[PDB]
Amino acid sequence: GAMNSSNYAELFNNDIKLFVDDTNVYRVTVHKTFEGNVATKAINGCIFTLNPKTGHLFLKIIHTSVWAGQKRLSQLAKWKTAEEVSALVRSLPKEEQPKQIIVTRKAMLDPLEVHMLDFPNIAIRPTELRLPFSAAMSIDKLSDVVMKATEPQMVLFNIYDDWLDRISSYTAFSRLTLLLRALKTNEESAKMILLSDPTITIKSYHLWPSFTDEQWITIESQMRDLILTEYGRKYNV
Amino acid sequence: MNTVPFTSAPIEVTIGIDQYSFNVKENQPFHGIKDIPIGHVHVIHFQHADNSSMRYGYWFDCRMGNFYIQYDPKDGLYKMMEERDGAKFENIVHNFKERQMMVSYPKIDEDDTWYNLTEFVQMDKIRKIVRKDENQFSYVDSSMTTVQENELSDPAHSLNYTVINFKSREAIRPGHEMEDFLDKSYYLNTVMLQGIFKNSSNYFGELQFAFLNAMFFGNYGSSLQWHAMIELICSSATVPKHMLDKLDEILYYQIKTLPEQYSDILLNERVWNICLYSSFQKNSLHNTEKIMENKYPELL
Ligand SMILES: COc1ccc(Cl)cc1CCN
Ligand SMILES: COc1ccc(Cl)cc1CCN
Ligand SMILES: COc1ccc(Cl)cc1CCN
Ligand SMILES: COc1ccc(Cl)cc1CCN
């Protein structure tokens, strides 16, 4: 059924599962036409498909050419997402195929269920958690590869860098969601926290900075404060 | 006009024949129903007074035999029987008519209600849905499950309606996933009409039989099937124009025959508010939209 706080450790068991977030698939800028009307211009997007146990991220880049001449693009974007996730599953060896796919938005359920009819044993589930995966495009290197794409492309990342050498998957996912929640709440301040230090660096093969364990505690606490400080800001507290 | 003689009425029961019903008291001198219009299927239905639980009955065609009702006190239900002695039967009927022990099928001459509810319903098709081939009539009751219900338990007692599942490989062409899910024309026209039902008459027959089973008995599997067959049409962008006009007439007489007290429980909100107001055919059911709104304005 639905994934929530109560069955949260299930994310880190040994049954392969993927989260699928479609927020960033169809991305537009709304603007005015010469005649004083409103139009949209699309920009490249991405499907965010993440194994929460291993940190493996299948970033399918959605190039704006896929929208050319199509109508009802918000609706199509859900079915395109479902088509591409199904293609990903079919591309994986059987022992790598997920047993469950958890969509972050319930409107993905029927499109993904329909595209996965050939996979009756793969459970398609919603979640009651508010996950901050929309902020994936705040990670500089993911945003870079998406905007530079000139054609459809899949790029593989480990969104946990090397953290699983030192922390558990549960803790890595908690660090990830905190970071992304901070970037979603106040992108500018979150990035200031991550990068203001001229002594700290991101490895060429990593997404996040190379923090010692103690520095991560400092960073994590600064992210918590940011989320609390922003809460007071927007809700007057 | 044909006759169905009763050997007696030993237990208090409400007896129906098509849209008519009447109460018979325990051991009242009831010996059956006369003046039954030839040319249509009929259904003779029962609900015992001492246990309204379990409505049951028999679909039959007087053109296919001489049928009588004998109460069975072991199985506790009014059973339909075929009578060999062709003139045993005629002599059985003539005796009770002469003693005026039968009720007359009370058909008003203006009234096409029964024809309109059974236009496409034929005994031959009923008997493929209800599988008991040693009798010429078909038993149905409140509790019988359908084949699709049995997939989601006794198969011989099943209603073998055609399975309809909108999230199924039968319904969805590889590579037309969004197209086929959002527009069910492929599934309606190619899979169901051309492939399975052969024509719309057989489709409407099953649709009408499903409605009558759900309405007359309280058969939940039957209501499910009726809803599904309506939804499959309304959710198809491409439907022959003769089918849309006929569907409108079919449903008009159903929702209208349907006593108001059964509407609260029998009618499914998502299936109907979609068909009338959101579907491709939302504008193609004028008569049917005119009967529900007239008698159900609270709904919308
Ligand atoms: C004495 O037998 C009868 C009386 C009434 C009725 Cl309807 C039928 C029968 C036929 C018995 N096979
Ligand atoms: C009087 O006929 C009936 C009796 C009982 C039930 Cl259950 C339904 C009907 C339908 C009549 N449209
Ligand atoms: C939803 O309940 C119903 C709908 C239709 C019919 Cl005919 C019967 C029921 C109640 C029996 N389960
Ligand atoms: C009188 O009840 C109704 C009338 C029309 C429609 Cl569509 C549905 C219902 C029952 C609602 N659960």
CB–CB of A74/A47 below 8 Å?
no
In terms of Cβ atoms closer than 10 Å to its own Cβ (0-12, 13-18, 19+), residue A78 is: buried
CA distance B36 to B3: 6
- Choose, out of A70, A79, A108, A117, the residue to mutate when testing the contact with B (most B CBs < 10 Å): A117
**Contacts with B115 (C-beta within 8 Å, 6 or more apart), sequence order:** B40
- A112 in Cβ contact with A136 (< 8 Å): no
B177 SS3 class: helix
3-state helix, strand, coil in chain A (%, to 5): 45, 20, 35
Q: How far apart are CA A171 and CA B156, in angstroms?
A: 56
A87: contact with B, CB 8 A cutoff: no
**For helices B241-257 and B200-217, what crossing angle results, to 10°?**
10
Q: Do A44 and A84 touch, CB atoms closer than 8 A? A: no
Gyration radius from chain A CA atoms = 19
Angle at B278 between CA B275 and CA B284, to 5 degrees: 55
**Domains of chain A listed by start with CATH number:** 9-163 (3.30.420.230), 164-237 (1.20.80.40)
B264 lines ligand 4 (CB under 6 A): yes
The Cα of B163 is separated from the nearest Cα of chain A by a number of Å equal to 17
Burial of A128 per CB tally in 10 Å (0-12, 13-18, 19+): exposed
A90 to chain B: which residues are within 8 Å by CB?
Answer: none
| Exposure string for B171-190, b = 16+ CB within 10 A, e = fewer | bbeeeebbebbbbbbbbbbe
Please state, in angstroms and rounded to a whole number, the distance separating the CA atoms of residues B125 and B160: 11
Rounded Cα distance between B172 and B178, Å, is 9
The residues of B whose Cβ lies within 8 A of any Cβ of A are 167-169, 172, 177-178, 181
What SS3 state is found at B226?
helix
Ligand 1 touching residue B92 (CB < 6 A): yes
Does the CB atom of residue B237 touch ligand 4 within 6 A?
Answer: no
Find all residues with CB under 8 Å of B220, minimum gap 6, and list them: B149, B214
Backbone angles phi, psi at A156, to 5 degrees: -100, 135
Residue with tokens 């005026």: B100
Which of B168, B169, B177 has the CB atom closest to A79's CB atom?
B177
Resolution rounded to one decimal, in angstroms: 1.6
Tally A–B CB contacts below 8 A.
22
Contacts of B175 (CB under 8 A, 6+ apart): none
Q: Which two tokens stand for residue B126?
A: 């009923």
Which method, experimentally, gave rise to this model?
Answer: X-ray
Q: Is the Cβ–Cβ distance between A103 and A125 less than 8 Å?
A: yes
Q: DSSP readout, A8-33?
A: GGGGGSSS-EEEEE-TTSSEEEEEE-
Angle at A195 between CA A189 and CA A201, to 5 degrees: 165
Query: DSSP alpha helices (H): ranges in chain A?
Result: 73-91, 109-115, 140-148, 169-185, 187-195, 213-235
DSSP state of B145: P
Please say whether the beta carbons of B12 and B25 come within 8 A: yes
